[model samples]
Target: FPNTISIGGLFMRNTVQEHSAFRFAVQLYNTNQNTTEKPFHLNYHVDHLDSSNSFSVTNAFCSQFSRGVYAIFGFYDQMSMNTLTSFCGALHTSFVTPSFPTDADVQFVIQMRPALKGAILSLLSYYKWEKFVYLYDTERGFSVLQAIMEAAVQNNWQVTARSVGNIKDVQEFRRIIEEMDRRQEKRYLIDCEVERINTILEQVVILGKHSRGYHYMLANLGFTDILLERVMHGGANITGFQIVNNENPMVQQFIQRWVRLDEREFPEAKNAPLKYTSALTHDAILVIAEAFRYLRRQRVDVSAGDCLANPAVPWSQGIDIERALKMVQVQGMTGNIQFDTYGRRTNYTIDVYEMKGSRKAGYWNEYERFVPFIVVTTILESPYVMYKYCVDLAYEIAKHVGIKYKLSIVGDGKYGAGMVGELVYGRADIAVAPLTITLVREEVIDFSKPFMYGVATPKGSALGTPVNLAVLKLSEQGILDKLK
Candidate 1:
């Protein structure tokens, strides 16, 4: 006999990509099933919330709960996030999401969106940006702004925040960009929805600010999700992080199918590159399926419960299912998917990209420094002595620190010094050469503490022991070296 386990999806009414992706992932999982004894089928039920009020969310939760869904996915708006997650926690039902909330407070929840604080800070550090303009539109964007402000205090970065949240007219938004340009402010950190980001970039081009003189770091993760034909030729140094690794074989196949899927099923969904939320929504479904698969393997069975019952008893298997979700370590469109004890996504790599031609430059992770190289800057004073010495020192540092380094000669001058300026201006990660540290230099750049070696994990959760041992084995084998 075939078994059926239902899953529920909660989405805002106007959402298109997420909705379609939700439907597609369920269909994808259903058709591509393995012929296990007693093959299980997934039933997807969806409910749309018109408003973000708690009353509406509570109704939606009870509605899905009554349907007997083993897990619930979605409801991306910030207003509905806490309420729904907390509601799910109270009932001990798994609530997986692609939404951005840094706080790790809820139970029976799996966050697919990676923690952005570490990635954004690492990117800022890579650029050596001490000051820039921060443009944000929504409260969702403001949360990120708040994080940036907190980091700025520690990094001594001068952040000029401007709220475009109130500006509804296109001209009004254009005028704001004009004012920044008039003041010769060349660096900007833009945090907003994808639509707003496109508007801002359009204005930058209209103002002729999308050129070599300007640099932008977009806070949105869907840098490659949209079509880049318009901004590719602008020549501005645009940097952003994308969770969807287009280079992954799985992603390549997914995108190919997504184009056809949207064409037939979701006409409203853009044919452009797959958005982060859409891809995340798809991954969330798969995650739950993997957990359910594990449960079946263990002879665990799940039954539906009615939340509206007079004397409602929580699903006995709810905690076990939640534990299964936390234990899942599957690869999805967003890369190596894993969650920590707190249900926070801890071990994932966010791909860093330069928008000029939308190229994959490198990547950043919580555990490691920027990939590709450490970017050591020096001058070739003598081919044998000065240059060779710097190169040899860089090699030693790279070996000791377990990192890769690139020895680049200072371009503007030779038999000279601009290495400090290069490091200060963010051109190089480190300057390795024979130079004396001065008080003025110390004020500008930090002097590294005389070289030393150092090292860091999952905690307080199910499957911790075996996973740790596997990770330890991989680390011992220097498997992480390939990632560098």
Candidate 2:
């Protein structure tokens, strides 16, 4: 009986850390599983998939076939992925990937990356972003733009998009920014890779766009994977999501052990936090190993499939392996890993992050209910006493809105006239001072129905509608009347 199985990996030339993580994961798996009753060992075959050529991916797959492999795992460009998807389906070989494929009709493939559109939509809903500018850098970014545009139609959101080409193209990037400035569009969703994201944020700051009144949502899953010290102090409201949950004990243990790996061998991963792709690659191996363990329990055997044959011979066990991979539910570094029938990861936790020193704002779940920390601004006045009246209004509104709020007094104390600067600049999330609703004041900021009076906020603030509704409810209940 054969006790050894071979696994294949296909990676881009630049993803050195992902390749290193793959080898380390296999080594760790073999070390941990050797003591099992029906112990099996894994041998790995890795090849760099040429990003420009689909044929190179086919060559890599053929090479794996020649040497024999039980499963294939890796990530790279979408063009190569399409080729691999078709080959894997035709040859009945299980392919696990960390990249998000554009097409949904996949067979014998398990997508390890969590779905992005849902999480993005949840963030949009939580922020109440009804209108904003979308900036895209690549084809993948365009795909996201398309998805968001369709969603915008249904949600009655108004969205406009501009292409930044590459963040390195400073001229083009600045042109876009200037246009945004001319239009006074302050909210933006930037779609690009992590590498480009860092540059984009820096460029935005350099161009004077990273100030109060500017809000940006970075459309990258690895937002917190890298250090964002450069843009953290800009006062702009920066937001994004991180797929990897560093707070989990399992993740901490994984990182501690991973960093201890020979630094010379894994230079990219040495003394640095794991990149999103690298972490996903490690988890991809776990998924394959787990699927094999399941098969071993039922006494299943696997054979390699050949592509060069006159009539292609597909692996008989590939479908079972694919099913097992999809059926697996494990808590990997990226949090709960589970997949739907389409091989898309269905259940996982994405931590929402804000650049107020890169703090964890909250976590987005499938339920679409998020509780974010909000900033409430006010001044000592009639309705709002430093001790109670105004402070009480803010507390009650926060409770009704289902958000946690920190009370902040406006530095310039002229009712909400001065507080307008706080709201408009995004220094404050909401202004709960005794504000009078007037045409002139309303032009610059939004005012909630007065607690028998009115509260103030920046124009287009997501908190405006909800805070107003809460104030209305509180007033109807005589909560305002009871207040001194």
Candidate 3:
């Protein structure tokens, strides 16, 4: 286990930004490369290119994994990521990638992408997009739509989702739009490629579906393209995410060096501009470098070959290496690059923008920001509710999740109507104390499924879940279906 480390870059040669990201990572690594005593020496190798074939990804990754490369990085397609993830997990190796626009959280892979679902959820909570129609094209459509669906199921949201991936003729598109219109639903959540976005909007124009009060959450990040402009006057709320903070002074600084340079030096980036992929790649390398730094500090081994040679013990040596990578955190072109034990990017921001007026002369502004803040309501009781243990539990949980919260005391004597009633009557978002869950209590109010606290049933009752039919309150049931 020497200081010398090799990183494998499995990339698609046809991909412009990912390849650019790899080169950028290598360039930055060389500029700061060093030794185990001083720093950690690092290098790179890539013997294959893929436009996307499961076999190519398998061979490239398996070869590198066997050769004992420290870590592997690529935006592997759905075709091979499953096998690749399984391989990494088995070998105790790490696979790092910037972002893939889905809620795919795999343990063996390191995703440096900010939590898009969290940001979108924050926006929904802000606007309270409680009821909307979700339109999608593929299985990733569920990744794009599943969070909302989960929200609906858990929180009692009024929403519906349907697939429009089979839109062959414009008449089929017409049929789908008619059904949506008949349902009187004006809000829509759409997930598709940037090209598909253009196609959808074009059909919307033909169908005249872009009427007043229609709103859409365009699931594609790059919604600022020319295709979006044609729908500018569609008279709808179109919101999208932009990872690269183009307006940031730091981005201006990055552009001055890498992208917005002399027109003669970089012809490719003349009008093209550096995309989020390039910025994402820059952060990927920073993470690997920081991980190496942690490895050297912790005296972790960087050896790789033996694990490949033996199937019995697939480099238990890299267990510490995996831990070091998980602990690494740094700033890069896309801002803060970080990971958790599960390798999901825990802390970072995704810029939200809304297209209101014209697409070319776009009306984009911040919507709901995904900040970490919570509000807790508890009654100040003698050795129980208001005790410092309550404070300890609250702040500790908050710290674990990296959020800021406000603690307010209801100050009502020992779970009385005044204190516990506050939560019952919708005066608080969360209750932290000697609170009991019962049918009467649950019917009136909702509760988080007991965190930092044990759950229990009401003393005598087994506690049946509340279920009912539609159209009327549970009080007046016996309609579409009855609850057991």
What are the per-model C-alpha RMSD values against the true structure? Answer: 17.5, 11.5, 20.8
* Candidate number of the best lDDT: 2
lDDT over C-alpha atoms for residue 120 of model 2: 83
| TM-score, one value per model | 0.70, 0.74, 0.66
Pairs that collide in candidate 3 are: 35-39
* Order of models, best TM-score first: 2, 1, 3
User: If both were scored by TM-score, which would come out higher, candidate 1 or candidate 3?
Assistant: 1
lDDT of 1 by residue, 1-484 (tens): 1278878888887677778888887888888746762258888888888555778778878888876677888755667766787678778888887877546466788877886778887888888788788888764625576688898898888888888877778898788887776676779988887778887777665545544446888877777654444455545678888787766798989877777664657754556456788888878877887877788787776665556546556777788888888878888888888888778887888888876556777888878867743576665666523621345545544553344667677776542236566665656665555556455655565553222211100112122222223233334446434323
Score candidate 1 by lDDT: 0.69
The sequence of per-residue lDDT tens digits that candidate 3 reaches over residues 1-484 is: 5657788877655456456546655765676535542365568886554635667667777678767677888765555556667777777777787646335556667876565566676666767777787777763425656777788899898877777766667677667777887887878877766666677778876655553367877766654553765455444567777767666676776667665344443345446656676677777777887777676666555664553455557657667777777766676776665677878776676766677652321222224355422556655765544454555555543443334668888756556336556655555444455666556665555443443222222222211111100011211323212321
Q: Write the per-residue lDDT of candidate 2 for residues 251-287, one digit (tens) a residue.
A: 8888888877897877666776688888888788777
Off by over 4 Å in 1: 52-54, 102-104, 141-143, 171-175, 225-230, 261-272, 299-301, 304-313, 373-484
Clash counts for all predictions = 0, 3, 1
Q: What is the lDDT of residue 481 in candidate 2?
A: 92
